[PDB]
Description:
The structure is cut from a larger assembly and holds chains A, B, C and D.
Chain A: E1 3-8, H1 14-28, E2 39-41, E3 49-54, H2 57-64, H3 71-75, E4 78-79, H4 85-89, E5 95-98, E6 108-114, E7 120-125, H5 144-150, E8 154-157, E9 160-163, E10 167-170, E11 173-178, H6 191-196, E12 207-210, E13 218-221, E14 235-236, E15 250-251, E16 259-262, E17 271-277, E18 282-286, E19 292-295, E20 300-302
Antiparallel strand pairs in A: 1-3, 1-4, 2-3, 5-6, 6-7, 7-11, 8-9, 9-10, 12-13, 12-15, 13-14, 16-17, 16-20, 17-18, 18-19
Chain B: E1 12-15, E2 21-23, H1 24-29, H2 36-39, H3 46-51, E3 52-53, E4 56-60, H4 69-73, E5 84-88, H5 94-103
Antiparallel strand pairs in B: 1-2, 1-3, 4-5
Chain D: E1 5-7, E2 12-21, E3 25-26, E4 30-31, H1 34-39, E5 45-55, E6 58-70, H2 85-90, E7 102-104, E8 107-111, E9 113-117, E10 122-126, E11 132-140, E12 150-157, E13 162-165, E14 173-174, H3 175-182, H4 187-194, H5 201-214, H6 220-228, H7 241-252, H8 262-283, E15 297-300, H9 302-331, H10 337-340, H11 343-356, E16 371-373, H12 379-386, E17 388-390, H13 400-403, E18 427-429, H14 443-451, E19 455-456, E20 469-473, E21 476-481, H15 487-497, E22 506-510, E23 515-519
Parallel strand pairs in D: 9-17, 20-23
Antiparallel strand pairs in D: 1-2, 2-5, 3-4, 5-6, 7-8, 8-16, 9-15, 10-11, 11-12, 12-13, 13-14, 17-18, 19-21, 20-21, 22-23
Chain D binds a DNA duplex through residues 105, 107, 352, 355-358, 373, 393-399.
Amino acid sequence: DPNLWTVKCKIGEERATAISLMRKFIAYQFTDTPLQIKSVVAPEHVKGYIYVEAYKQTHVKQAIEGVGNLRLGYWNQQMVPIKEMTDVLKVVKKSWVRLKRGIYKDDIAQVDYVEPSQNTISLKMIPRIDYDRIKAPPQRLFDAEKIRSLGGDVASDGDFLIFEGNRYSRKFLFKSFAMSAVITEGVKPTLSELEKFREHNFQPGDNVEVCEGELINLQGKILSVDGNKITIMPKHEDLKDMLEFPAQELRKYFKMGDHVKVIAGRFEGDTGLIVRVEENFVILFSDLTMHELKVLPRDLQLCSETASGVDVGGQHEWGELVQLDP
Amino acid sequence: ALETVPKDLRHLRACLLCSLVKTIDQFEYDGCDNCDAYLQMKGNREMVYDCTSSSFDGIIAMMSPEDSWVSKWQRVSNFKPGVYAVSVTGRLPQGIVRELKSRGVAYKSRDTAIKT
Amino acid sequence: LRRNEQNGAAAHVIAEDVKLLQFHVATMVDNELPGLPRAMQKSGRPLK
Amino acid sequence: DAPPIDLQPPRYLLKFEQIYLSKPTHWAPSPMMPNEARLRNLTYSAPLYVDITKTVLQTQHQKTFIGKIPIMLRSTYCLLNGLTDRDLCELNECPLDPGGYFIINGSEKVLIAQEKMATNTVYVFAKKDSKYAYTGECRSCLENSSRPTSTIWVSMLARQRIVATLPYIKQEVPIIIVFRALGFVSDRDILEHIIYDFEDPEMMEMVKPSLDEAFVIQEQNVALNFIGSRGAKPGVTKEKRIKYAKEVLQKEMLPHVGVSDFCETKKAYFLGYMVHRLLLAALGRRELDDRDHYGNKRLDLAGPLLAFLFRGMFKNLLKEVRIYAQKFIDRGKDFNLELAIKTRIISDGLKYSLATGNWGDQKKQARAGVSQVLNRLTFASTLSHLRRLNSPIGRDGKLAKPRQLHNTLWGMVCPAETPEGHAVGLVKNLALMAYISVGSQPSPILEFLEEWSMENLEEISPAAIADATKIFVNGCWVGIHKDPEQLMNTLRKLRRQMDIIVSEVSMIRDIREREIRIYTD
DNA sequence: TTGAGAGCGGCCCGGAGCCAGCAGGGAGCTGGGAGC
DNA sequence: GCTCCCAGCTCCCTGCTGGCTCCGAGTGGGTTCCGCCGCTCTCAA
Lengths: 326, 116, 48, 521
């Protein structure tokens, strides 16, 4: 059986190099110098080098002495282990999208209308434009009056407007974009994007309780965490046996009077002592600001480092002096 | 040969039975190169669309199938040389499967990819 | 490496990129190594 | 000397044949005064053009701009050429300034001369610290050799045989099997090539171990297979190992005496000459050589330096042009010459190298201190910094001898002018009468020899080399003659009258050992 | 509508330990045959 | 004719020669230097 040899090529041109070499084999297979190799392999997830299935490195060299994309592998080729054949051959696997190219790269766009021609779709998008002021960009709301005042390439149709190379806006850009240039899977816009247009997070050292099943109302400490079905190892009170529970069965229950932290939300980054634990609402007085925060047990978290008392930007602390106006 | 060899990268799609990776132009001009008599690929487009899958992962240039362990792995050692697909995502229609079974050619799926 | 071991796991790119990461952390320890060439910057000066 | 670039597919080759140098001119095309250039922090760089001959269908493209090349002041193509004191003071430049320095980015820079070992000359030194008894080294390099200089070592082992150290060779190959790989498998012509006067019994007892070790190989092909073995790129079998051995024998083995099958016998004779020198060194009849001899040291000026640097980066430019044309012919489109040539990659690279003084292209390490800033403090200071000489031997070291003061300095360097700090003696300042040889082609000299009566080494009978005197030109061996008398006098008087022998080219007649060397270098 | 430009996006010797390779004693192993 | 002192063997072990890291006195002052290539859309003709 022929063996596989790694030969290096230009990145992003492996398929074109393979097509060129097999076309050269077609053009020279009936000649006096045929290619004695068996095949070539170009995986879709492997970039930088390709595989040659052949018996000899001399045959590999005689195959790759063609187009100059394979020069650095023409200097030397490497071998593939016999057990790596299978690992080479294996292949592993009113909406919202994100644009690929242009100045609007990686931005949330709302697919409003889908054209049945399967070519372009209409997107409502936030314009990253300077309204023809700097160019002769952060996201901001479209200003039809401002762009009409600045003039230039602009056409006014009330709420609808055309500017800067057939960029269409209404009330918000409403422009057709390519199906291949948009990504329709794996977007998941957040609440801020919803306003403009489940999850499990368990950490070791925290206490979680079981509220259902034959092991009901059982509080135990978190030892491990997994993706969906954790099969946790809880340290239950008066129970040295090491049970198993998923995140759906567990609930982040904390004992009365402990330092609790908010992982995310409006009250994120705060530390405080709880007041009364209801079934969903937990009220706490935060430490730096003795203020009532009503948060969820899922948003709650236990840690030993209290609030630092400084902003997210690292510029102003709590209880600080600033200038509202001069 | 060159008739089996595709001429361009546009509209590449693989067959469902022999996993032959050829373009729409030579499906229209020649059809299949392996089981054309068993499929009657010539003279239509809707049935060719049903009998071909546009989603294929990886291609292999088997041209010496009598001495190729890769050809023995994908069971294409008895087929003609050409461009074949490792994985083909699709299935023939029930009537075509039943008529192939009646003619004596059992349809074996080429979907060798691991689904999760 | 983390993404590749999460999804691909073809193990050849894994081993080769692990060797380059090992060379990178070895460069972090010392830029000058008798066994491997030193790292290079676009400014033309050797790394410290 | 740069070969035309040929590429297939429709073949085409591009060749450069005519230089069109121009007066320095920036853009609106106008010449720059050196004063205003150094005031606006510009450079005194002159445009350069070539003509292009392409054959895809022959096309000619004359006056094609490569880049801008720096010019030092008061040169033959400078604006300050032939202008008198009145014209120069009207042009607000000093008439008494010597000139001859580069101005880059407004900064005033002067090259310092580098001292180098002599080229294409056998040299014998004491090597008792190593395992060898003696070593004879030869730096082989052609005039305008695209490859850099190579070094051939021959070594007498201390114990009693002779081996060799060769480029791209990881072993110490015997001289006899080298001769057999060259083709001289006969002991008789091996002896007649290693000696000139046949009656040498002392040579018998000091050569017998080498041949008495190496006689067992008697085949040229077997010897070439041995050369290919233990090499940088050894063949799997004798096939292509013979090719590796042949390309080593051609390209690497003595290129200064020529690279051809006709030059192969000259290579063999000259290898016999170095081993003869090694034998006389071992006997001690001929005195050994000193590395501190400034006769055996050469002094590079800016000319060879700039020529070498431009050669290397012009090779890089040709690499860029050929990969650009290869990209377009892969794309199936005709290559564009003006977009193929890069004024940036020529002019900016030259400017960076000259301004920095590091002797590389962008990164290279590289030798620094090649060019410094002129000390505009005193006229005497300027003259000293202009006539300054640099020995690149290792500073901050305890090696006393190369920075010691040598006897060979009467009238070449003033004795009592040294730097005082960490480097005392490695930096010299040029004396008054001392002048550097500009160098000349030795082809009219060889034509003088051959119109005269000094026969080449290939036509002369071997045994009747015992009586005659050897004749070398620029180190490499040319021929022999029976009586050097009256032809030494003819060469002297022709040098005096500058009819065909120039005053600059020198000749030395060793009468103690029967030879004469001509130096055009 | 197409072509190039602006800007975003990605790619010269010193010592001295020091291991490794090799070379000579050395007792165990089992034959050799002396002894019973 | 089988132990056992002995001979040859056979591993056994301490005892000699090579590639190799690491060092190489004190301040001022001036000069040079820190991407390149790729790539897609904007305005101009």
